[PDB]
């Protein structure tokens, strides 16, 4: 009966005043408005011609427009009504607008985006529901707020600031609290000294004042003020402004660590107008007490809470039909909740035809009120039982309802692979299994648990028996791979306000909670209602990476994990971003909180944006299972960044594509092949292979016009392409060619991870005031078995130098004894580093075909390690002593983070690779650790 | 928050009045009493004085 005056699509414009049947939901109002338009309207012929889908219901909230996308939403969920009541807008107004068709601008933009991604986002040919499209319509508002909350100038410049304390082994290099800025301009090299703790604004003001009467020498217009300029590295684009001590910029620290000069050049601010984002027209899109049958008459019933249903869950497996079979066979269905198997069911052997039928029922033990939000209905065709097929299906859906009706699903064939919740896109040669979920005259709408005062924690406040505490806190202080026996789960589930002030226990507390029931989950959602000893805890991000793993699928465990991660800083985010990407696979739905986190992160930084883009693209090109989800994420991202970033992505994609074409052509099969390489490369130069594409592993290092005489094809197995571009930046302080190797046939999902893990290890050692100088050479994966590898010049394979050798060679390369000793050191430090790191990562054992002595580093990541004679000889034992000491010291430094090493190792071996985890416990194993580690070294020696 | 603290503090003093309003006995007499009790029941305690193995059901016999 609610009176709402509707703005009619057609006319002075005509408005219809109604009495909306607000008791029901939007469908009733739609029918009422339709009939009223049919009858009252003088132009009723217009709407009579038009069907129901030719008009949309949009309402003006605070000025903008919002869509009533779901008619299933109840009147209360219509925030317009409450908004009006607060504003007392009676009758309210909902604009009945007429639909329209897309324009060509939008279509071209969409084709561009789909070309970037490598996979259509508007594909609806492999989805059995509208989860994807609603994810897409929902990600808009977070992106609009993220973009509106950006600083134009600073983002354009994207200063790469930092806030970690300066390590000691660099504080020796720094003296007098000052550094030497080699200012450039045009060709003048004006050197001015400034204190190591000055903001760039101060430096610029000081330089302006000092040379306020000589700047014409520097070749700068006198008419310009200080703000008319901003510094910039030479040979890159990393701008240096903002508010930060000039000691806090990663490039300054790199220079200091490697002991090289600091060179800057004046520049101008990339104008904010170049960062415009094209406008978007897409308008922006209960509990158990209100949604229960009890206390109502059947004629006023529209919904039935999932908990009233005391019955048992049962499913109808009609049968299977495959176009062709690619023995005994039989099905097995399961319910699952994060690698858990709540209940199991199966059937009996059957003939192995191309199609089989039962129409049988399978009944589950778990009541329809005991189901958790996120259950997985696994369906496993075994054969004889050697698994041959699988597929999964959520039981509740994204919009808080239960699945009901006939479903036909296409099976995958045979990790994070088996938890996928999407249907095979092969609709014409995949095995299809149909099923029916019994229907319901009303929909089954699971509410969300209400947190209420839970006083078991409130008024159990004294301390517990020092016996029970002593047997509990010995269990809690175990490995994060600790098997929790039901004893342990019990002892902890009763002590559910003792381990609520011990963060180091959380992934052992919620590993016990039983998700098979309904009271357990209510209690556990009241447990998380008072978390004042978690939010304000210590932000240990080696822990939060266990609340976002396979074993956990809840909707608030991951929420608190992401709340912890929200407070990280940009560089910290960058260090682990590979796993955060790898940790959106397990998000049970498509839309989640980790995904919105990555979205919001990519729209206020640019290095994060770039690396996010490349990782999402690699997975979309590879992870067929989740490719739709990643594509949704990536496209929701690409509508927010600026036009210039879009163009840079486009150009990088073009270059990689052309190089892939040339590579695939080349590996089709002597010097004629080399000449054909030359011809193809020259033609590509002719075919608009551009000369300005920010090299993907380095958003600053631009590679210019190719240097053709330098390329070649190596004689190794894969025989990659040895490209040698030239820098496109004229101000470069040198002229070394930006090298790359381009290689086809070796999986680049391992070497991309391992490198992240060793980068983290380097960060840890740095935090522990050491420096073992490992070299992470930027590697990125572009497709399947295809990758672009950065080139480390000044290098030579160990094998080669052998085909006292290594020592002589070194003495030669360094005529001066001082440089020789600085080398021998940059060799000891690094050989130690690598030896320890590989003894930890369990890969040390392999022939010496992947090692490049620039310093020392390893390549081509396929006994503790290799410590061949030549290395030690390069290092009687004096340097050999400094070697052992640095080895053992680093070993224990790292054993103080075995929690983080184990979590990263496991989350890696579960999502990257194609009894195997235990080696990290034995390997990681103070005197005891030292003795064990020294034993390894002595054995290799 | 006075009505709770006061209602609690009253229970304390009403308890301490209970405990203090008791007629205790001299420690010397308490000891004498316990010593003469053990002295009285010392014979009837096989753990204190080992009794014959025959009277022990655990050692002498397996049938019970």
């Amino acid at each position: 009966l609610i009176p709402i005056e509707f703005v009619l699509p057609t006319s002075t414009p005509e408005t219809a005043l109604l009495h909306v049947a607000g008791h029901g939901n939007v469908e009733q109002m739609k029918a009422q408005v339709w009939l009223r338009a049919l009858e009252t309207s003088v132009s009723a012929d217009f709407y009579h011609r038009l069907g129901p889908d030719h008009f949309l219901l949009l309402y003006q909230k605070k000025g903008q427009w919002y869509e009533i996308y779901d008619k299933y939403q109840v009147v209360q969920t219509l925030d317009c009504l409450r908004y009006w009541k607060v504003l007392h807008r009676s009758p309210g107004q909902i604009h009945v607008v007429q639909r329209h068709a897309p324009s060509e601008e939008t279509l071209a933009f969409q084709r561009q985006l789909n070309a970037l991604i490598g996979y259509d986002v508007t594909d609806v040919s492999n989805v059995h529901d509208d989860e994807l499209e609603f994810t897409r319509r929902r990600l808009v508002t977070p992106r609009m707020a993220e973009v509106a909350g950006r600083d134009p100038k600073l983002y354009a410049m994207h200063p790469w600031v930092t806030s970690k304390p300066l390590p000691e082994y660099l504080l020796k290099k720094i003296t007098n609290n000052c550094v030497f800025i080699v200012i450039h301009r045009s060709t003048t090299s004006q050197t001015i000294k400034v204190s190591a703790d000055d903001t760039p604004g101060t430096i610029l003001q000081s330089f302006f004042t000092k040379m306020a009467k000589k700047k014409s020498l520097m070749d700068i217009p006198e008419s310009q003020n200080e703000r008319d300029f901003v510094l910039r590295v030479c040979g890159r684009d990393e701008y240096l402004v903002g508010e930060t001590p000039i000691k806090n910029f990663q490039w300054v620290r790199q220079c200091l660590k490697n002991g090289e000069e600091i060179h800057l050049v004046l520049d101008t601010p990339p104008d904010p107008a170049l960062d415009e984002v094209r406008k978007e027209e897409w308008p922006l899109v209960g509990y158990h007490e209100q949604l229960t049958i009890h206390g109502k008459d059947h004629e006023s019933v529209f919904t039935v809470s999932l908990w009233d249903c005391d019955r048992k869950f049962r499913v109808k497996i009609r049968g299977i039909d495959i176009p062709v079979l690619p023995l005994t066979v039989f099905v097995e269905a399961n319910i699952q909740y994060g690698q858990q198997v709540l209940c199991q069911r199966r059937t009996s052997p059957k003939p192995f035809t191309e199609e089989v039928l039962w129409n049988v029922w399978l009944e589950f033990s778990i009541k329809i009120k005991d189901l958790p939000k996120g259950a997985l209905l696994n369906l496993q065709i075994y054969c004889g039982a050697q698994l041959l097929y699988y597929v999964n299906l959520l039981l509740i859906d994204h919009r808080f309802l239960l699945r009901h009706g006939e479903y036909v699903l296409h099976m995958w064939q045979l990790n994070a692979d088996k938890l996928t919740s999407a249907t095979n896109p092969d609709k014409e040669n995949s095995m299809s299994i149909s099923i029916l979920l019994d229907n319901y005259c009303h929909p089954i709408a699971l509410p969300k648990h209400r947190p209420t005062p839970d006083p078991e924690g409130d008024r159990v406040r004294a301390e517990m028996p020092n016996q029970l505490r002593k047997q509990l806190e010995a269990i809690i202080a175990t490995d994060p791979l600790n098997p929790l026996t039901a004893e342990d789960k019990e002892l902890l589930w009763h002590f559910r306000y003792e381990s609520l002030k011990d963060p180091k226990a959380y992934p052992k507390l919620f590993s016990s909670v039983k998700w098979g029931q309904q009271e357990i989950v209510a209690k556990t959602y009241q447990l998380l209602a008072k978390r004042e000893v978690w939010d304000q805890s210590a932000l240990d991000v080696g822990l939060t990476m266990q609340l976002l793993d396979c074993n956990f699928s809840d909707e608030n465990v991951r929420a608190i994990a992401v709340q912890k991660l929200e407070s990280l800083e940009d560089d910290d985010v960058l260090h682990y971003l590979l796993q955060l990407v790898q940790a959106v696979k397990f998000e049970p739905y498509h839309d989640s909180a980790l995904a919105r986190f990555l979205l919001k992160r990519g729209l206020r930084n640019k290095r994060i944006g770039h690396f996010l883009f490349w990782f999402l693209r690699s997975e979309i090109a590879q992870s067929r299972h989740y490719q739709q989800r990643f594509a949704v994420i990536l496209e929701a991202y690409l509508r927010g960044c600026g036009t210039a970033m879009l163009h840079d992505f486009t150009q990088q994609v073009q270059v990689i594509d052309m190089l892939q074409k040339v590579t695939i052509d080349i590996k089709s099969l002597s010097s004629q092949v080399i000449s054909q390489l030359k011809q193809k490369l020259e033609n590509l130069q002719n075919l608009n292979l551009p000369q300005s594409f920010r090299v993907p592993y380095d958003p600053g290092l631009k590679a210019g016009a190719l240097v053709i005489e330098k390329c070649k094809v190596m004689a190794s197995k894969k025989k990659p392409l040895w490209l040698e571009f030239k820098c496109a930046d004229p101000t470069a302080l040198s002229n070394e060619t930006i090298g790359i190797i381009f290689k086809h046939g070796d999986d680049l999902r391992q070497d991309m991870l391992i490198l992240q893990i060793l980068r983290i290890m380097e960060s840890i050692w740095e935090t522990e005031s050491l420096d073992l100088c490992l070299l992470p050479y930027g590697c990125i994966s572009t497709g399947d078995k295809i990758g672009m590898i950065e080139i480390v010049k000044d290098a030579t394979t160990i094998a080669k130098i052998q085909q006292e050798v290594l020592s002589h060679w070194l003495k030669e390369k360094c005529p001066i004894e001082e440089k020789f000793q600085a080398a021998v050191e940059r060799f000891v430090y690094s050989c130690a580093g690598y030896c320890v790191a590989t003894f930890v990562l369990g890969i040390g054992d392999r022939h010496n075909d992947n090692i490049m002595i620039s310093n020392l580093f390893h390549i081509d990541f396929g006994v503790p390690f290799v410590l061949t004679p030549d290395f030690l000889f390069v290092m009687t034992s004096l340097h050999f002593q400094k070697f052992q000491d640095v080895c053992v010291k680093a070993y224990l430094a790292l054993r103080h983070h075995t929690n983080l090493l184990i979590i990263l190792f496991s989350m890696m071996l579960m999502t990257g690779m194609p009894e195997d985890i235990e080696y990290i416990r034995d390997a990681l194993t103070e005197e005891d650790a030292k003795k064990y580690f020294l034993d390894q070294i002595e054995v290799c020696r | 928050n006075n009505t709770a603290s006061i209602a609690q503090a009253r229970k304390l003093v009403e308890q301490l009045k209970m405990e203090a309003n008791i007629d205790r006995i001299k420690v010397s007499k308490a000891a004498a009493d316990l010593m003469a009790y053990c002295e009285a029941h010392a014979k009837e305690d096989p753990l204190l004085t080992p009794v014959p193995a025959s009277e022990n059901p655990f050692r002498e016999k397996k049938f019970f």
Partner: protein, 339 residues
């Protein structure tokens, strides 16, 4: 005003109690007992071992027959043993795996147990069909059931982790009386031969004498520097000993309302898990968390002997009603009878 005057009245009545106790402290038990002959060395031998429990044993209790005894274990079962024959009169599997206590009824018909479930489940051995059926679920406690002792076939007292005790009527399944006053989790209790009084031990390092009839705290004893883990009445019923995590035992007399004796040694550093008196009371058998169970002279305070028959913590121990034998449970999943 009202609260500061009531706090100073509390803290004056407290020193009035301290002076009322110091007045009676005329002579020590070590002086009076200097004369009596030392008890010597109680050389004990392991007579029986009770195999069958699959995990830690948490509690045990002799029957009034001096032959049967219950024992609770982490394995989720409640077994009734025949000490003489080692045969299990019953092997009851439990609904809750975290059972912590058990108590053979004096009548022999019922046995009770409990733990983390916050319920004192009463079991019937002499059931209509002869099976092991649960007579009652004594619910109402807000914490784990820490200990309980049968008064009769229809009455049973239980302690819990809610910092209170309670008397139950098995028939109504209702807390007849509630013993409030403790400020800590109540680890143990012990009924006097006269069923009208019982003591209880708590983590506040103090014990309290309760009136079963009324339900009031009669006296409060202190002296332990740590949680009291075990407590029981002296055979006569005028004194009681307490075991604590402070690695020391103490004897308390009700009439003297103060500590009489301390039983401890510099070597002993771990807490006491259990205690029991001999039928006469001259011997105090204390269980320890170092695989040992030292025998003290109650009057001399000398360590007469040690019972070392377990590879793990000796969590619990008991004495037969006839004082004929000593049982000692342990975390090694084995009980042991001693003589």
């Amino acid at each position: 005003s009202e609260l500061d005057q009531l706090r100073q009245e509390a803290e004056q009545l407290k020193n009035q109690i301290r002076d009322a106790r110091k007045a009676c402290a005329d002579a020590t038990l070590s002086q009076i007992t200097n004369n009596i002959d030392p008890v010597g060395r109680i050389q004990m031998r392991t007579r029986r071992t009770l195999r069958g429990h699959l995990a830690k044993i948490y509690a045990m209790h002799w029957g009034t027959d001096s032959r049967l005894l219950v024992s609770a274990s982490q394995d989720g079962k409640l077994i009734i043993w025949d000490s003489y024959t080692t045969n299990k009169v019953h092997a009851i599997p439990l609904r809750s795996s975290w059972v912590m206590t058990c108590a053979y009824a004096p009548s022999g018909n019922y046995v009770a147990c409990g733990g983390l479930d916050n319920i004192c489940s009463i079991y019937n051995l002499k059931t209509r069909e002869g099976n092991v059926r649960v007579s009652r679920e004594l619910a109402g406690h807000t914490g784990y059931l820490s200990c309980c002792r049968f008064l009769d076939d229809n009455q049973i007292v239980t302690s819990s982790g809610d910092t209170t005790c309670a008397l139950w009527d098995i028939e109504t399944g209702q807390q007849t009386t509630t013993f409030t006053g403790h400020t800590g989790d109540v680890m143990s209790l012990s009924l006097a031969p006269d069923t009208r009084l019982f003591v209880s031990g708590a983590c506040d390092a103090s014990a309290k004498l309760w009136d079963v009839r009324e339900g009031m705290c009669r006296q409060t004893f202190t002296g332990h520097e740590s949680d009291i883990n075990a407590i029981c009445f002296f055979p006569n019923g005028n004194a009681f000993a307490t075991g604590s995590d402070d690695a020391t035992c103490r004897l308390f007399d009700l009439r003297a309302d103060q500590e009489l004796m301390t039983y401890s040694h510099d070597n002993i550093i771990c807490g006491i898990t259990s205690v029991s008196f001999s039928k006469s009371g001259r011997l105090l058998l204390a269980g320890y968390d170092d695989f040992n169970c030292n025998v003290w002279d109650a009057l001399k305070a000398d360590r007469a002997g040690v019972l070392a028959g377990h590879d793990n913590r000796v969590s619990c121990l008991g004495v037969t009603d006839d004082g004929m034998a000593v049982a000692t449970g342990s975390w090694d999943s084995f009980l042991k009878i001693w003589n």
